[PDB]
Amino acid sequence: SIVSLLGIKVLNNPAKFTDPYEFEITFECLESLKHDLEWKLTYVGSSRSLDHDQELDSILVGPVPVGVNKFVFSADPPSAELIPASELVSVTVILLSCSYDGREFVRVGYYVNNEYDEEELRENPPAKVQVDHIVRNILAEKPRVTRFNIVWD
Amino acid sequence: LVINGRTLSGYTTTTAVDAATAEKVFKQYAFGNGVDGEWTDDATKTFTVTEKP
Amino acid sequence: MTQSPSSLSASVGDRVTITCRASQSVSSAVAWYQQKPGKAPKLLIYSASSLYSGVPSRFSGSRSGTDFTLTISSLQPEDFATYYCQQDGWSLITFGQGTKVEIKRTVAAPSVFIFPPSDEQLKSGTASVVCLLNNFYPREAKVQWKVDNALQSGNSQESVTEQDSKDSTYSLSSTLTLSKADYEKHKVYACEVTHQGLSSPVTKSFNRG
Amino acid sequence: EVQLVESGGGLVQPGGSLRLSCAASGFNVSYYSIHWVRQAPGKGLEWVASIYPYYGSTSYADSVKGRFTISADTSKNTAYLQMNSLRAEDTAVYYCARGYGWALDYWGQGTLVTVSSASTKGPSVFPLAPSSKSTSGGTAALGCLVKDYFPEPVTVSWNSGALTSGVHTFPAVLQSSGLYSLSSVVTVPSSSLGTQTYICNVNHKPSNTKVDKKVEPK
């Protein structure tokens, strides 16, 4: 409850698969404390017989002031070598998560679409996924938010 | 409407222009009670029907 | 999107599975709710497989392709309710048609009672006669309205009770409504009930029409 | 404890405008996602509107498009489903609910929204009277017939709540006239038929009606 989110803006939208995530994250802090904030971005996939979750990047914002702080979290992109070919061209999900001394207190989930920029390539796919021609689209205008009450003290 | 009969006892409301227009619908609310209707108030804006066995 | 089966009879301790088929394969987008009558839905499982806090461990979920599934590893008395899958998809939230999970018991016969219009009503020119079907399992029941042995169509209107908590039975009320003239025209009115727990159809009647 | 309370339900004309209000407690609605879901009598759940957080931003079932506007006033910790151009298909119990990721963890109790051209009218209460032939082993059945009222709901009590066994109040039915009627019955010992009076208490708040009918043999 001590920290809440005013906003998240996805500056790089739409973007390439390989393109990083720049997340302008407006947030607020009431009653400051020392142990510092762990902002984690987690890729979540769903494919044929698997439900894969892998962490993408993690930033630490320090020190934590009171009021409205706007910081940009630059996050590392996905790795097609570690993702099935279907999740390359399909809808996926990313969980921007912030945690306080081990304790996740807020989790913002976003739909994400991915597909080919080329017109024909979209009508008839290449035999192999060409990540260079994949383009991603974050549905950041409609966050899906989960909040967890952690012992801030 | 204060309804009190051998079998039925209760109340309903309706708002209207004059008590005679109110007393007209109240009448139409005689699911067989009206037959034995005493049909008696302007100040208190209550209209009572009575029966007896 | 597509929820099967719409209806399930079962006993305590049984192991039940309901299945939802959605267009999307995103496990994050799917939850399940339980609803009892007169009450708001309760969340049970979120993002395909996660046990919402508070919910008992006998509930469980999973995804295989486009199909999602809830199972209850051993029913309980409190578990008899209606169940709904939710797909929180890209553009819009969808709900499955629902699945009602009723109790199974032995086949009970209905007490069939017939009731005359009463004269309070026949004052205002319309007469309603109702047949009652008290405590019968299963719901499979057809009443036939007969006046002077002329089968009656288009007039009847029935409503059914929900499964009772004590008997696990059902009650049905079929009302027959006629204009007082046509009530007074014919003399004897009867109600014929062909529940499957009735070898022959039982008929209940009255006179002084 | 977090609560959610709907408001503004009632009767409305076809093509009419209504506005519900989802009042929140235990949490501020700006951080959370807020939705409206409705349930026609004896029907599945239907979603109509979502408001997402941070940036407003909404989603609407195709059927309620343009006619409906979900929104929220964070100052007043409250949301609003606004329905215009309302049709007879939109009559239902409207739920409002907080988002839990892509699920819905907390719900209101709802409000009933009746849209129709019928007018508000208290019920007629006609009897269902027991008989002497209907001695089974020694069990009889009497009931009240609650007829021609608008709009739902009616409540029926037997002997002021003191008669809770063997009783079945029925789902109301919509009739061709557009009026509601409901029947409430109770099986009772055929012994006590003669010495024990039975009254059904009928309450229909929409028209401020509360009557007590006594059901007796002929």
Same fold, C2-103 and C111-206: yes
Q: How far away is chain C from the Cα of B22, in angstroms, using its nearest Cα? A: 19
State the Cα–Cα distance between residues A97 and C173, nearest whole angstrom: 56
The CATH number of domain C111-206 is 1.20.5.510? no
| Distances C132 to C157, C184, D128, D180 between C-alpha atoms, Å | 12, 22, 10, 19
Strands D180-189 and D167-169: antiparallel
Best residue in B7, B31, B36, B49 for a mutation probing chain C (most C CBs within 10 Å): B31
Tell whether C88 is within 8 A of chain A (Cβ): yes
DSSP code for D82: E
The CA–CA distances, whole Å, from C86 to C20, C28, C75, C196, D40 equal: 9, 11, 22, 37, 17
What are the tokens at C144? Answer: 């036939």
Measured CA to CA, the distance from residue B9 to residue D215 in angstroms comes to: 12
What is the rounded CA–CA span in Å between residue D70 and residue D35?
8
Where is B25: in which H helix or E strand?
Answer: helix B19-28
D102 Cα to chain C: minimum distance (Å): 5
Question: Between vectors from CA D133 to CA D127 and to CA D139, what angle results, nearest 5°?
Answer: 75
C81: tokens are 């309710």
Exposure b/e, D77-97, CB count within 10 A at least 16 = b: ebbbbbbeebeeebbbbbbbb
From chain C, the residues in CB contact with D181 under 8 A are: 175
State whether residue D138 is helix, strand or coil: coil
Using the Cβ of A111 and the Cβ atoms of chain D, whether some distance falls under 8 Å is answered with no
Q: Please give the Cα distance from D140 to D187 (Å, whole number).
A: 5
Say whether residue B40 is in contact with chain D using an 8 A CB cutoff: no
In angstroms, the separation between the Cα of residue D211 and the nearest Cα of chain C is: 15
Q: Which is it for the CA torsion A110, A116, A118, A119, positive or negative?
A: negative
Kindly state whether B8 is in contact with chain D, defined as any CB-CB distance less than 8 angstroms.
yes
Contact in structure between C19 and C67 (CB atoms under 8 Å): yes
Angstrom distance (rounded) from CA D18 to CA C136:
42
Q: Which residue of B has its CA nearest to C122?
A: B32
Kindly list the domain boundaries of chain C, sorted by start residue: 2-103, 111-206
**How many contacts, defined by CB atoms under 8 Å, are there between C and D?**
125
**CA D104 to mean position of chain CA atoms:** 22
Range list of H helices, C9-80: none
Q: Regarding the domain with residue range A3-147, which homologous superfamily does it belong to in the CATH classification?
A: Histone chaperone ASF1-like (2.60.40.1490)
CA distance B36 to chain C (A): 11
As a whole number of angstroms, the distance between CA A27 and CA C3 comes to: 41
A16, two tokens: 């390439």
Task: Give contacts of A49 with chain C, Cβ < 8 Å.
Answer: 64
Count of beta carbons in the 10 Å neighbourhood of residue C143 = 23
Closest CA to A123 of A115, A131, A113: A115
- CATH fold of C2-103 reads Immunoglobulin-like (2.60.40)
Any B CB within 8 A of D89 CB:
no
Q: Do A145 and D55 touch (CB under 8 A)?
A: no
Contact B31 C119 (CB under 8 A): no
Q: D touches which chains (3+ CB pairs under 8 A)?
A: A, B, C
Distance from the Cα of D113 to chain B's closest Cα (Å) equals: 21
Mutate one of D120, D124, D146, D204 to test the B interface: name it (highest B CB count within 10 A).
Answer: D124
Tokens 């227009």 belong to: B21
Other Cβ atoms closer than 10 A to D60: 20
Q: Does A137 touch chain C (CB under 8 A)?
A: no
Q: Distances from the Cα of C10 to the Cαs of A114, C13, C138, D20, in angstroms?
A: 44, 9, 13, 39
User: CA dihedral in degrees (B2, B3, B8, B9; nearest 10)?
Assistant: 20
Tokens, residue D195: 């010495």
Instruction: Give residue C65's region: left, alpha or beta (phi > 0; psi -120 to 50).
Output: left
Q: Are B8 and D207 inside 8 Å of each other by CB?
A: no
Asked whether at least 3 C-beta pairs link B and A within 8 Å, the reply is no
Q: Which residues of A touch C49 (CB under 8 A)?
A: 51
Is D137 buried (19+), middle (13-18) or exposed (0-12) by CB count in 10 A?
exposed
D54 vs A contacts (CB less than 8 Å): 5-8, 143
CA distance D37 to D70: 11
Resolution value (Å, 1 decimal): 2.8
Stated length of chain D: 218
* C-alpha distances out from residue C209 to B10, C128, C175, C189, Å: 30, 12, 16, 7
Q: How far apart (Å, rounded) are the C-alpha atoms in residues D183 and D128?
A: 9
Beta pairing, strands A134-138 & A144-147: unpaired
Q: What is the DSSP letter of B23?
A: H
D42 to chain C, any CB pair closer than 8 A? The answer is no
Sign of CA dihedral C127, C131, C132, C138: negative
> Minimal Cα–Cα distance from C16 to chain B, Å?
49
Q: Which residues of B touch C123 (CB under 8 A)?
A: 30-32, 35
Which of C124, C126, C128, C180 is the best residue to mutate to test the B interface, defined by the most B CB atoms within 10 Å of its own CB? C124
Q: Token pair for residue C62?
A: 């999973």
Report the C-alpha gap between D103 and D183 in whole angstroms.
Answer: 38
Strands (E), chain A: 3-10, 15-16, 21-29, 37-47, 50-61, 67-75, 92-100, 103-116, 134-138, 144-147
Class in CATH terms, D3-115: mainly beta
CB-based contacts of A68: which residues, under 8 Å, 6+ apart?
Answer: A6, A26, A27, A28
Cβ atoms of D207 and B5 within 8 Å: the answer is no
Peptide bond into A143 cis (omega under 30): no
Is the distance from CB of C10 to CB of C101 less than 8 angstroms?
yes
For chain C, how many residues are written? 209
Cα–Cα distance between C7 and C82 in angstroms, integer? 9
Question: How many CA atoms, within 13 angstroms, populate the side-chain half-sphere of residue C63?
Answer: 30
CB proximity under 8 Å: C 34-73 to A: 48-49, 63-65
Cβ pair B34, B27 in contact under 8 A: yes
**Exposed e or buried b per residue across C166-187, where buried means at least 16 C-beta atoms within 10 angstroms of its C-beta:** eebbbbbbbbbbbeeeebeeee
Angle at CA of residue C7, ends C5 and C13, nearest 5° = 95
- Give the DSSP H/E element, type plus range, for residue B27: helix B19-28
Give the three-class secondary structure for A87: helix
Q: Which amino acid makes up residue C44?
A: L
What gap in Å lies between CA A71 and CA A98, rounded to an integer?
13
Instruction: Determine how β-strand C16-21 pairs with β-strand C67-72.
Output: antiparallel
- In words, the CATH class of domain D124-214 is mainly beta
Pull the structure tokens for residue C141: 């029941």
> Exposed, middle or buried by CB within 10 Å (0-12, 13-18, 19+), for C13?
exposed
Return the CA Rg of chain B: 11
Residue C109 CB-half CA count within 13 A: 9
- Side chain identity at residue A96, one-letter code: L
Collapse the DSSP code of C19 into the 3-class scheme (helix H, G, I; strand E, B; otherwise coil) and give the result. strand
Of C86, C120, C175, which is closest to D183 when you measure between CB atoms?
C175
Q: Name every residue whose Cβ is closer than 8 Å to that of residue D197 and which is 6 or more positions away in sequence.
A: D159, D214, D216
What distance in Å separates the CA atoms of residue A121 and residue A131, rounded to the nearest whole number?
Answer: 12
Residue D22 phi, psi (nearest 5):
-100, 105
